[PDB]
Design a protein around this ligand. Structure first.
Ligand code: NO2
Ligand code: NO2
Ligand code: NO2
Ligand code: CU
Ligand code: CU
Ligand code: CU
Ligand code: CU
Ligand code: CU
Ligand code: CU
Lengths: 333, 333, 333
């Protein structure tokens, strides 16, 4: 009887950070309450100043990472303020029935809804908006995020021993399809209805104009670089709601990787690069062994370094010359 | 001595249905006899009325699913009627030697051939036409299907316990490359030889114009939606002979998935989405838990909802409010 | 203390051949010394005579396969002769720290450097040039190879029993992006700086003009076809530093496949086709069972047979009619 269960209210945080949680469940099953407010907003996505009309959960691209345990109930209050112009909904890949919730959560501007589902399968999962007839337009406008459903006894390695992270980040990767004119310059639009046919035409090229982490070129760099210390265990959750990606930590590895995100399966070990299919979340566990700057990319390097799918880690600590050293520094002889 | 084995004649059915078979082999090894007749035919592939010259096994795109057991012999009589114009052949990814049979099955119009091979490896496998010098043109004209080679003791889970399906469907996914003029409209052609250079040019874009299930936009919808009941175990075999896909059951999961189709490997559990590489068949097992309409898609949602890679299930039964419920229906407050 | 270890000098060979090594380590850990000389050179990559300015390690596309054992130290002397025009460096996906070595190996023309790293994880791994701000341009000019790090006790199957190859080949697959004019013809350039913006524009299409094995259309065919005998065990290492591929042995299988290349994981069995993500090396083990010609392809068949990603094996020995036979040869009746 769900009314006899504890309720716990979660207050979400902006990606790539993740709201506080316990790896190992410290209670029995709970109804875990979340609220998200849909926000249609202009976003500048590149260094050139290209501005799109983003469709967001909670103001961000991606939407925030939600975290529960297996056989908790997720109860989401989804708000679509009357400041928005479009109908929206939500499909959880973690959920069972009604198109993952999309059939039950259609909210016009000025409406709200509350959906509850049981998180019966452990893993990281995509969630995304999916309004009938307009699904890829919403998703590729940034209206997607992820949910992690931890096993109640936390993560385990390929032999059944615990894997405990010290830090977790969520990297949402977004393919955008900004319409172009015949000369190649990005077009802009005065209403969503006036944009729609050209959005469809741009999507049908299957060629993104931009592929970004955390909503913009360079978002996870500089003052917003990811951080870690030597010897810290870091879980990077990575989602792509629409298109394949191939994550890679430049200078590191995925020590344990669930490339298709589902924790009942043993992880793949020692990965250089892995394939997260479009429509999937994956998760990589790494223990840092060297300080300095790392890049974290989609290893189609064009997608990374020309189209935006690249972020950085700044790692503190001592350098290990046993693991790597310059024997003879670059010089002319 | 193969002449001392039983022979069994199979009569194929049109996808997405699958001819009758036993999961667990009820006989010893057999020579399993199949006949397919090649048919070149016009097909309308979209809602707009776009008509292509399809190249088919047995009249359908995809070709029918053939089913045998491990260490049976497949004996295929391949007929190319003199009503056809082209040379064709067949390559089984399940077979060993002679380019999978393609070197031994070259049939001009008005010829036939009979190939026999031993099905030594269990799995779902692509079969496709592959005439030297014209391979992607035949494949991307729809001239491909799949063959399932069941283990003699049926399917097993990741712990070695039986998995038995109640229903099986075969979803063939086809990338088409309909040539376009400079303005973007589809071109048509008076002979295959007059089409060939423009077919090659369209293919070399690597950008399909259409990506469809069972030969056409909307083929697995309406009166041809897939069906199941709550609690039924369903195996969906999915092939893509030329290009990657990423299947997803909207509202469900792949409870057990052989993403690259080979049953000696333990399945992946609880998948949201999985990657079937171009040139591969995969298979997903699911137990339905909720009634209603599901969509089954390639989760590049552009490929799904703009280019055609989407079908539906209609599922009967009782709704489980424990698994999902609307707590507060969409309303303004 | 690394100075107390044996040093062993390796003399590399041109792909697809692989320098001599022991599967099972016949010594303790060693410092394994390699030297590579960077060569910028013109290469003709297709049958039409299309000439690009390639950027190579040791004169070849791909660069040579390096082979060590787990917990050996790789010591690479990288030479950039003053006959070259560009700055280059090297990133090993096998290494830990400093962007895989790229931060420590920046060599202008007329410089050299020596990098040492510990090969702490067993697998096949990409190595590639990666100069800050110019990474995909160098990689997609051919400046990439692979390194195999064998377990000290050699390869093992999914049950822990030895897998020993008789022969090994390295197939480097290269996506090129030759700039095109408005009419579709390839452009040429008088200096690297004059080429750069058009190289970036061509890359941003995400549509390769050519996809080749061993540096050119048809490179692994004819007098340079791969060879084997019936009953020989063959390991094919396959890399793709920038873009996904889907290898397939036409007429065979991958009996044991590490699709993402890391030997601590059990291999996938009986694969028809597998996905090697861009930025990864994979490895397939097969025992040949039939003589004759095989094709080895990227099973996007357009990429294979139109864009160049296809090679051949010539296999000697006796034909097995139990495994495959023509029962009735193609004829009219
Ligand atoms: O290894 N850096 O792509
Ligand atoms: O979850 N529907 O793409
Ligand atoms: O099976 N040949 O693509
Ligand atoms: Cu929306
Ligand atoms: Cu979805
Ligand atoms: Cu054909
Ligand atoms: Cu094939
Ligand atoms: Cu370089
Ligand atoms: Cu790299």
């Amino acid at each position: 009887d769900i009314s006899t269960l504890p309720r716990v209210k979660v207050d979400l945080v902006k990606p790539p950070f993740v709201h506080a949680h316990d790896q190992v469940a410290k209670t029995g099953p709970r109804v875990v309450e979340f609220t998200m407010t849909i926000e249609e907003k202009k976003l500048v996505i590149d260094r050139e100043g290209t501005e799109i009309h983003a469709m967001t959960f909670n103001g961000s691209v991606p939407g925030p990472l939600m975290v529960v345990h297996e056989n908790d109930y997720v109860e989401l209050r989804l708000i679509n303020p009357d400041t928005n112009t479009l109908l929206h909904n939500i499909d959880f890949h973690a959920a069972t029935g009604a198109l993952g919730g999309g059939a039950l959560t259609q909210v016009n501007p000025g409406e709200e809804t509350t959906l509850r589902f049981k998180a019966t399968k452990p893993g990281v999962f995509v969630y995304h908006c999916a309004p009938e007839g307009m699904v890829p337009w919403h998703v590729t406008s940034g209206m997607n995020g992820a949910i992690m459903v931890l096993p109640r006894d936390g993560l385990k390695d390929e032999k059944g021993q615990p894997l405990t992270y010290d830090k977790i980040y969520y990297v949402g990767e977004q393919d955008f399809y900004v319409p172009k004119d015949e000369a190649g310059n990005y077009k802009k639009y005065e209403t969503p209805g006036e944009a729609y046919e050209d959005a469809v035409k741009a999507m049908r090229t299957l060629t993104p104009t931009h592929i970004v982490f955390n909503g913009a070129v360079g978002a996870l760099t500089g003052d917003h670089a990811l951080t870690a210390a030597v010897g810290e265990r870091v879980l990077v959750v990575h989602s792509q709601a629409n298109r394949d990606t191939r994550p890679h930590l430049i200078g590191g590895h995925g020590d344990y990787v669930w490339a298709t995100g589902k924790f009942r399966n043993p992880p793949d070990l020692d990965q250089e690069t892995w394939l997260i299919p479009g429509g999937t979340a994956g998760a990589a566990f790494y223990t840092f062994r060297q300080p300095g700057v790392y890049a974290y990319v989609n290893h189609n390097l064009i997608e990374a370094f020309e189209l935006g799918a690249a972020g950085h880690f700044k790692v503190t600590g001592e350098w290990n010359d046993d693991l790597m050293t310059s024997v003879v520094k670059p010089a002319s002889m």
